[PDB]
Design a protein around this nucleic acid. Structure first.
Length: 158
RNA sequence: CCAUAGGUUAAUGAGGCGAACCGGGGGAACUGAAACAUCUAAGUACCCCGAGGAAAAGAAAUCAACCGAGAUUCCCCCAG
RNA sequence: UUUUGUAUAAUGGGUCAGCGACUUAUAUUCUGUAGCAAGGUUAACCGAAUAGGGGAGCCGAAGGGAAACCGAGUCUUAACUGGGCGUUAAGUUGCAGGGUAUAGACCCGAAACCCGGUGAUCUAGCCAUGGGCAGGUUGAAGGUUGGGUAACACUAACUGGAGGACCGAACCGACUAAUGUCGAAAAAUUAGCGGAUGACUUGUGGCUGGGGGUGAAAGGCCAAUCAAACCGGGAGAUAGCUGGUUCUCCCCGAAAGCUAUUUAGGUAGCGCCUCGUGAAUUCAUCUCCGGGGGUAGAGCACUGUUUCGGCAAGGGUACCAACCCGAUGCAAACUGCGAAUACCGGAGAAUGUUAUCACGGGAGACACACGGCGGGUGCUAACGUCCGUCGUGAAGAGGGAAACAACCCAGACCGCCAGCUAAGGUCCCAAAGUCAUGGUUAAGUGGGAAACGAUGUGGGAAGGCCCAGACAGCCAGGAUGUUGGCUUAGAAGCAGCCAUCAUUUAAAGAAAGCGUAAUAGCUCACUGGUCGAGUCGGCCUGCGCGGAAGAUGUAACGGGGCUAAACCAUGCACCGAAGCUGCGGCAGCGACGCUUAUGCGUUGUUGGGUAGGGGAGCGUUCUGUAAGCCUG
RNA sequence: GUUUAUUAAAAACACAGCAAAGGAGUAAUGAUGGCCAGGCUGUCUCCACCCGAGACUCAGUGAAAUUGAACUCGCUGUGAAGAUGCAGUGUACCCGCGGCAAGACGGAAAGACCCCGUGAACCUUUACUAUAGCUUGACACUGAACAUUGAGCCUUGAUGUGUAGGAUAGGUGGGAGGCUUUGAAGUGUGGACGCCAGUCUGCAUGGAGCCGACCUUGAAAUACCACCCUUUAAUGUUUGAUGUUCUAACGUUGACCCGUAAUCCGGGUUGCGGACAGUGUCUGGUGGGUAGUUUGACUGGGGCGGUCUCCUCCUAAAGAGUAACGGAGGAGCACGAAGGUUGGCUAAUCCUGGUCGGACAUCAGGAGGUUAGUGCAAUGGCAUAAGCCAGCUUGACUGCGAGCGUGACGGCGCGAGCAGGUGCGAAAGCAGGUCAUAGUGAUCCGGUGGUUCUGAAUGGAAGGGCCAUCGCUCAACGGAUAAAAGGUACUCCGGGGAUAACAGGCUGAUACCGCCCAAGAGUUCAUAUCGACGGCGGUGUUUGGCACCUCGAUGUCGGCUCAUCACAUCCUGGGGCUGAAGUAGGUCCCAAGGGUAUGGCUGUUCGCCAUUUAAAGUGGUACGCGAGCUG
RNA sequence: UGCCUGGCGGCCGUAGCGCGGUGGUCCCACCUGACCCCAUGCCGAACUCAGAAGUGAAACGCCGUAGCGCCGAUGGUAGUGUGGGGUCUCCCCAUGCGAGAGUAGGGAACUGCCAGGCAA
């Protein structure tokens, strides 16, 4: 016995995967192991829009009902993992910058712990300049300099 | 150094108010779709600028079709 | 008003007077009317102008197809014996009206969103200036004088006056109780109560302004309004929602059903309602005829289900048991059978204002309730819920059931101080039989209630014993071992193992009750005599009694009261409605004899009515008629 | 110390401490949580009296909520279901004054509770949609010198044998005269490619002659050239990524001077950075921080649970149709054959005999006429067989299709027959799918193939139109978006008793009580007292079933005050039986005149505990009584 | 015209089964061989081809037999439409229709066209 609710949920997951692969760019489609017919359907869906595009996506999901999805799911998982890693690194850099702007020496300690090679004097000078910019409504030159310095430190560490 | 900026004096003009109309710069929501996001409402509501008695536009780098009309503006058809 | 439903104790109204609700424009469809007619008609504009020009333009006469294109033909097809759309019917422009679509579009009512401005004299915080904190206490740091150390530490005496210190006034606050809730006060008064030198309080003047301000942080305060202030505009936002929709009369007159819905309290199509046109003895009741059922009933051939017995595969042969066989049952999901109704079609007399169908305009409604019948469900309980048919209410008053929509009789045109009748009634309330005949009842049954019980009473069929004398009564008998063996404690007939013998016999049992440790004793089955005629036990039942106790007051005939004024059978009379008939009066519908834009010498019938549809009218302001008429 | 101005002052909050311009086990403390002890008393048994203001009478002034109208009694039953107005019955002279409040479902607020609205408003997020902000890279402000290096256009030079061979020749080609002392053939030798087959040149002795089709070849000879692919190299060119230096852009809220009695600003010098930073467009990413929305319906109130489309049977009451969150089962296929024709054949279940083999394999005979089979759950039908086998085939075809069934409609199904061309069979004849009933998705949008149908001047083309076909568990399956989850007790708005919770009203499964039969218990004996197995009744004293009144407001558990009524009687009173010697009791009948507790635990009803009485009764009255009282 | 047979039908259990008797003059059946036509998922089994030697055994046709199967009244009863009544989870009254089962009884067929043989 198979529950209609489970079948509907599986269909929804298949349609979501189809929409994701359609959204993905040319390089992603090339990397993913998609057959010729599926690639043609994806290209047609990308070319078309509107209800026609959604029903082409539904056709893709119906085809995926029969065709295996494990390699496609693995490729999507790897791509999303890489993207999430990059996004998390960017978010952590932004958090470092924000805490440096707000607190000061407390964030300098964390920055030094994360990257011993970081220059404490330069970080303090940049933080003081950023505070002066905040007070005097000056452009975020110091904030962007701190962001670039953190990016360079992260790249050197990696 | 020159010179400029700045300063002093003389002459002309504006400074604000006024109901609506005109052009321009901004500019919504309610509501309809029996829901609602495109859309509509709407370039309407409302704010600002300027002149006038009207204003704006105005003499095609336009139409038309290879037949032909020769600025702009306004009214009725073409036309739901 | 809403409801299946309201006197409901569901909603609104204190009353009077005035004001208040389907209007307006633009296009479309239809109806009536008016001119023209295969033509009709003009917009803007001109116009000494409601005239006349202005044919720009719009509608139809020709449609088919997507189109090319064809043409009273055209699309499909390679094409039609074909099939889909047109031909044989006249449209147009106004006037008025019924709808349709947009404008706030029948009227009042939201919370809510955006735009532009006003608020920190209340209050939250902050900034600058000043003011206030009666009085009395605790009393550290520190300093001086001694004891005590190499120096320390520690300790006693004097000065000292720091504490978000203590008690307690002003001041701040509101923790408790009472009063005040249409109070003196839109958070107040009395006595207590905490702080009362600070993070305290306060006067004055400013700053922080609405998705914002402030907030020792409660979603608290921001001018008595704050989970997004106040004021003007979008804006008459929207409201599938609640309420209202105002003069009269005549005719007709439903539903709460099926399909679909982000769809259930709304909406779209159909059935149902109304108006008009056109159509066939069209439709309806019934007699007959040709029809198919699997329902009621019946049965178990089949499908299940159920009881007994046999052979019994197989399983563990005193033991479980398949498939089958014989008999007995049940089925909405069984029919070897099978109705009554109902439905279809045809023929036929009669009646019904065509009561039938097609089209067009307008609808309304799409919450149904109750009772009977056959059910599903629930508990064959529910004023419970869901089905199919009928009936009433909704939308129908009237008479009876005391009162009570859904029970019974019966469909109100109007008036009459006329008669008849249906249901129900005829002792009084209260109109009619204290009517007659033949029976039942002793119970207030009638006038609530079951399982069961009973010499209640009436009758039917019978049955047993009966003047060779029955049943019950009356002076009589009921003696002997059987103190029994047996479980010896005593059971002896009165506790049980046990037989359940035998003589006198007109006659009696080795034993039924009361009473003793058992005894004993008193009775009874049966047997003598008189009286003596009927007596005894069961079935069917009509009408009666118990089972039968509730709460404001008899309260389970309506009451009085009734022994017939209670129940069954029959009959004759009467009361009994808005039902029928009798008289007169009004209006619609169809006909014929005639009037022919209308009377009818007529004729038959109809006239309850909600939502709703059609038709006909009354009233008021203004305008022409109207410088006419009435009028000090 | 502060906190919800305006009833919540706390362990909560806060604190010292500890870890674009511009919170020091703890002394003390506490209107703090809990326990114990003493005093005190009107909190209470139980309340009595007195003092002042009202309340009462008189004189003067003088509102309010509410109001359909009232000539406005109780009881019984009915009724939209609790009657001042209905039917019956009893009672009551008319009209005032001081009180209580049981009611008039009494006044208050278009219920805050529950439901609905394809309602609103905030808050949350890995709901949808976006975006402020942040940010990546490219382009411009943005330059100059240098050190390399990836690559393109070329300029310039070699290099490149399947087999044929003087030859480590790839393609056409102006095709056939040039090279000549612009120091010749060949040479000591340096060097490049190198399948070791055979080309070559910076330089020179010498000194100025060598060569073209000529013989094979799918091409001929770098003799002159026009110009290139695999394979490589010197100069010049486009250049970018990266690195170093400089200033003239740009920054300077660094310093000095001036306008200037000037922390603004502008200008002049200088110092420090400097083509970095920043800004503007685009772009990748993040982004409940912000903003606009969504979160379906049936539902025995709502949520949860289950379902939303199609097929078979019943309910479905013998035409058709007919609902339930009613009772039983399936489906979103499959077959190029399991389809069409021609021909042929006919099982299940049993008995008999037979090696494995056995009850049940396969073989032969007997009964049997379908209980077999008919691909899929079931109905019906199927001997002509629609059931099974073999041969041939694609009619599972094309354009139609009269006439009907079926639904409101979209739509679905049947269908003789016309024309074309086919398959089977000699022929008559059959074939427009499957024995039939589930195996499916409207429209918009487009993809694919054909069609001059059209294609906005013409000739085309793009784009459309038509024919065929493809694309949705759009399963919420007549499918509102291509695109959406929750909380509100901070809530708000319009309504409902159309729909709940307390009560009211109907019924009585459940609950309590009474009774019929009587097995049996009771030392023998059913009925002194119980009494199983069974059955019949009364009450509305529990849980219940319905939702008929009430959501334009009926105050729902307790305690105090006040009580009233039924007896299914707790005591007192009158009796019967007894397994009643008497006191004391056990069971049942009549009897409601009277009475029928106090304290510790709870809010408690109830219940447990201790002590008394004759007892400390059961229930109805909106589970009595808040216009009477506390909460 | 009748005793017979075969084919094509109407009619379909009063029509079919169980038992006995009866037929080879014709027709029918059984039967012989299959080298050939034809066929066995193997077999002249079935079908097909050339004969009829032999026979009526089986089957087939006719008669009898009621032992079954089957048909089957009349009446009664159940049931039911209409209008009423009641001691109303059921029944009764007037009217109309009217079962099923069972019994008496019937029953072991009838009929249409043609062809062939016998006797007329």
């Amino acid at each position: 016995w198979v529950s209609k609710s489970e079948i509907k949920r599986d269909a929804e997951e298949l349609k979501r995967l189809g929409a994701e692969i359609v959204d993905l760019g040319k390089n992603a489609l090339d990397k993913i192991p998609l057959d010729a017919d599926l690639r043609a359907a994806i290209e047609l869906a990308q070319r078309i829009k509107m209800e026609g595009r959604r029903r082409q996506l539904q056709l893709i999901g119906k085809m995926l009902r029969q065709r295996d999805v494990e390699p496609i799911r693995q490729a999507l998982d790897k791509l999303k993992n890489r993207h999430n890693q990059q996004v998390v690194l960017f978010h952590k850099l932004e958090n470092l910058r924000d805490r440096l702007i707000d607190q000061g020496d407390d964030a300098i300690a964390e920055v030094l712990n994360l990257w011993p090679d970081a220059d404490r004097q330069q970080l303090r000078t940049l933080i003081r300049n950023a505070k002066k910019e905040k007070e005097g409504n000056k452009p975020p030159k110091s904030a962007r300099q701190i962001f670039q310095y953190l990016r360079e430190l992260a790249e050197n560490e990696g």
